[PDB]
Amino acid sequence: PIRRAAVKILVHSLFNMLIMCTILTNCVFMAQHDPPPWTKYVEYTFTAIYTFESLVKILARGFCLHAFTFLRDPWNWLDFSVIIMAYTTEFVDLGNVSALRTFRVLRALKTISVISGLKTIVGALIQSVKKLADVMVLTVFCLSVFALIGLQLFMGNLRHKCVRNFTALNGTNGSVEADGLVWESLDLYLSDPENYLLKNGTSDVLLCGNSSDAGTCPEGYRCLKAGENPDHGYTSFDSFAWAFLALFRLMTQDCWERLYQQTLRSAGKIYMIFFMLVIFLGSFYLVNLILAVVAMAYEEQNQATIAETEECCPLWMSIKQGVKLVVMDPFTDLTITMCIVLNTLFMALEHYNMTSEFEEMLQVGNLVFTGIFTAEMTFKIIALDPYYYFQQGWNIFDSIIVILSLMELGLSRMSNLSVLRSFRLLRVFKLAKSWPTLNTLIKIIGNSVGALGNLTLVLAIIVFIFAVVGMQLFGKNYSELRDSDSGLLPRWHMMDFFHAFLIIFRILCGEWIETMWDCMEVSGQSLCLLVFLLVMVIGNLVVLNLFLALLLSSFSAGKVWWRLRKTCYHIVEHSWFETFIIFMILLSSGALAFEDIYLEERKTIKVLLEYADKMFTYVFVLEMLLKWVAYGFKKYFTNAWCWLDFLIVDVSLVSLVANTLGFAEMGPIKSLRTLRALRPLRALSRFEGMRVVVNALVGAIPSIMNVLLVCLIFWLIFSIMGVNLFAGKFGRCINQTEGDLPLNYTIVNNKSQCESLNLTGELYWTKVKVNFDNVGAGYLALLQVATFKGWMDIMYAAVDSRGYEEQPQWEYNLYMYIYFVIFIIFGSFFTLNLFIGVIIDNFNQQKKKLGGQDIFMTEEQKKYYNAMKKLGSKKPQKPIPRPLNKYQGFIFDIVTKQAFDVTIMFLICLNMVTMMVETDDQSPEKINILAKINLLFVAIFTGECIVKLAALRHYYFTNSWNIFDFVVVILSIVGTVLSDIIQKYFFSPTLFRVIRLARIGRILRLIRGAKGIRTLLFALMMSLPALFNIGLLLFLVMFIYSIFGMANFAYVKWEAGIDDMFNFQTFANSMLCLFQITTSAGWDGLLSPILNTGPPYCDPTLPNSNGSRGDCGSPAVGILFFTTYIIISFLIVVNMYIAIILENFSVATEE
């Protein structure tokens, strides 16, 4: 029949064009929170077109029995469901919930089939996800184990609050309280939130945990355990569910410093061992294992697809010749490059408040630059005909630049400042021609948009789908439940699809938990948890896959003198001398830890440390002179290690040469004893682990320098744009009575008003600490944004910026968010892609150039590693033990069977489940049942253990896992015995809990049988030595930076990041903050109090003891400290990633 015409229309291209344009118009119509009534037209035309599509598709391969025809492709089910639902909801509404139209978002997924590239992109995505099977089960296993640990240790330790004092008052039958007023029913006093302490500055409730070191409930306040919870209730370790959630937050490192400062403040400073165990083993190892497995699967499928694809004339011509001769002179190219560079450095010289005529000089300079560029344009277009002069793909770009600049300058008599400059800004891209690194960067961007422009489109589709799902679900909830009595909505809601898109973007960045709480408290926990976990998982997976894709794609494509010399070298030969020196260096480094603010008042160890300093300098200068006398000058001064030692000895000498000789003690002389923090640097040349690691690091300096240059110029473009936009728009007013926020611009908008109403000393026009006012500060804001630490304030200050030097408005520039979206997606993401790519390339070719391949490992560690790799052999021989005599034969008849082990492995999972059921203040009746079932479990375990023992007499001690079972049985028996025996000792939440924790050995007894997890744990057992050397170096860096902070950053004003328990006032308080900052967490809050200066925000001339006239550090050294620490920590964790990936590839591919 006419089926021929239907199948003819099916294979058309106009068909796909119609499908695409209609789907896109729909997606434009689905993203509306409130569509006007005239959609019957719209939605009816849409459902008609979709039914027409499906009709054409079924008239081609149907009429009956469609099993080997249409409906055999799974993407047909989607269209079938869409056309079902589109007609379903037009006659029946019994299920009136209005949450069925949010199934319309499934037809926006049909785009993925009518493009033919996204289909195979998603095929690859699913093929990769199919490989994460083992990683997810290992992740949940370790997360649950650590969650049980945190459950035991911090059960109820998150509820402590500094409550007021009270007296029973003995005036009522029930417990009543007297506190100035009268309460009743003690729980009613405690649950009242008026008997709490708001933490300084913030609006939390001060936690205080009764212990020796953690927290300090103040004078008129008892530190008891009573209250709901912090963060509206979603934080405690009380139940296992909340514990699992908090430890997942820890694993994704999402706002984990807050959990850190809330747990250590109430449980114990010594508990940061738990946090440094989780941040290392869970977070940093599991994230890198995910990266490594996804990269391995991607590269494997890429290898597979590559393997498969394997199979008027006189003067005109005279001037033309002269010009073509002169213009192509490479010296003219050099001077044009210098002109471009000078122009970019001229645009940088713009800042917040330029003096008069400085802007005029800048305009004149850029006009001169325009003249130079148009002269080049004409004197090069004189060369040849546009037949060839308009080719090579570079001249067209230059011509577009010149015409844009010419047009924008001709448009001078108009209003344009923001994008006017951007028409001049893109000249920077010119110098990408003769640069072997900007070529690579633009090769990456082009591969992103041109070749691998399908996976980014998949990402955009997914972001749109999730944003509109979130809108449809959670739109109206925010509206009346959130805004204010004043009526202003939160900063992150889902009532626009722009804020919904922003929230999905922020979840992609990693900050998914604050919005999750804001949403859970209005729209129920179930849906709000499912959505925000699906977005997190899927979006981060696809982002990671895009990262690896682009990375790999752009990557793989008299005569007694000579006796005395040897005599004084004979002692340097003796190892005892070097051991003595190592010990003296350890002492001289440790002696720095005691330089804290309690040293002036100790008054006894002070002079001991003075004399120890003198003796250290003496024994070091003597040792250097002896190295000279025994090494001449050539070998010494060419070693480049003892050059560092000589450098240190220089300042150690100058120290005592200045003080006791010249009595100076003034100016930059004390700045030399703040530089003795470098004494631990002598440890680098002696501990072979750190020597090897620093060799590997300094090896990859050049490539790092080139990429630093290119990223610096790219961030320079972004920072000049930021200065053009935001220079002078961050200045807010603050009424200092109760003020950290603007003053409702309708009252005080301009700075003229802000300084024309100072009848009281209250109005302070205080700019944001980090802002865009010159290219110097722009780089700091760019670091904070691209690191996702402190960017909320930068955004909230730019988005609100309604003009130059005037008070902000709540959302007057709502769309300025798009600048930060563009920055985060280009600068941060692509910069980091290029960065990790060049680093892995350098490390890989450095290892390949060597012999013994692996780096970060000393020869002793290499031998230990070559011995360890033989433990997990391909096949350990079968024991097949002697069966037994009569008695033990009848015994072992049953135990050696292959179902007994599975039975035990399920009983032990039942034991895990009965461990999960714990809860704070569970029940007196229930603790009994739980202890009884626990002793029942240990009884069964002892029974199976003794049966297995009676099975084999000597052949029991060979499995190396059976021994582990026996050990856990013994420790469990001892724990059950000691359970109640104590009855006579001191407070034992620090003893009974740690004798109770030993029962998690049974939980760890699971992995005997899960090969997909035995291998993934061998991948860390076999990799521990390199992690250890890297950890030594990291601890050395922590030590040096903590001493620098203790010298400089003590006596700072206590505010946002620096409280009375995390500050640079002693060695422990400083090592805690530096461990927190190592993961780049909350360093924006640590740096904020340091950038203070004279009043307000501080007050100089304070009488603090050692360094007087303080109360607020200086920005210049603080920014340097924190930025260089961030870079160094980043490099070292990159090294960790490389080690993990290398070892995973060495263990997995070997089998």
Ligand SMILES: *[C@@H]1O[C@H](CO)[C@@H](O)[C@H](O)[C@H]1NC(C)=O
């Ligand atoms: C009971 O109340 C009386 C009031 O006269 C008071 O003196 C006494 O200390 C109270 N005792 C207790 C145990 O509260």
Ligand SMILES: *[C@@H]1O[C@H](CO)[C@@H](O)[C@H](O)[C@H]1NC(C)=O
């Ligand atoms: C407890 O309540 C009863 C009931 O009114 C009251 O008579 C009694 O006085 C109360 N107890 C005390 C100690 O006042």
Ligand SMILES: *[C@@H]1O[C@H](CO)[C@@H](O)[C@H](O)[C@H]1NC(C)=O
């Ligand atoms: C409040 O009670 C605590 C409990 O030890 C005590 O240390 C503190 O001195 C009391 N405060 C006042 C003002 O009495």
Ligand SMILES: *[C@@H]1O[C@H](CO)[C@@H](O)[C@H](O)[C@H]1NC(C)=O
């Ligand atoms: C704090 O310690 C005191 C003394 O042992 C005790 O009375 C109080 O209940 C404790 N509070 C908490 C929350 O541990």
Ligand SMILES: *[C@@H]1O[C@H](CO)[C@@H](O)[C@H](O)[C@H]1NC(C)=O
């Ligand atoms: C500042 O705030 C205080 C109290 O909040 C108020 O009394 C005072 O008038 C305010 N002054 C200015 C200049 O905002």
Ligand SMILES: *[C@@H]1O[C@H](CO)[C@@H](O)[C@H](O)[C@H]1NC(C)=O
């Ligand atoms: C500032 O005050 C005006 C009243 O004149 C009010 O309409 C506005 O909402 C206030 N600003 C904010 C941010 O609420």
Ligand SMILES: *[C@@H]1O[C@H](CO)[C@@H](O)[C@H](O)[C@H]1NC(C)=O
């Ligand atoms: C600032 O705005 C106020 C009114 O909002 C106006 O009177 C004043 O002239 C403005 N000053 C400047 C410098 O813009």
Ligand SMILES: *[C@@H]1O[C@H](CO)[C@@H](O)[C@H](O)[C@H]1NC(C)=O
């Ligand atoms: C406002 O006036 C007071 C009174 O002298 C002054 O201390 C304060 O610095 C002024 N604030 C600004 C931003 O000028």
Ligand SMILES: *[C@@H]1O[C@H](CO)[C@@H](O)[C@H](O)[C@H]1NC(C)=O
């Ligand atoms: C909180 O601020 C008050 C202000 O008087 C101060 O006395 C106290 O020491 C501060 N405590 C902390 C922990 O910052």
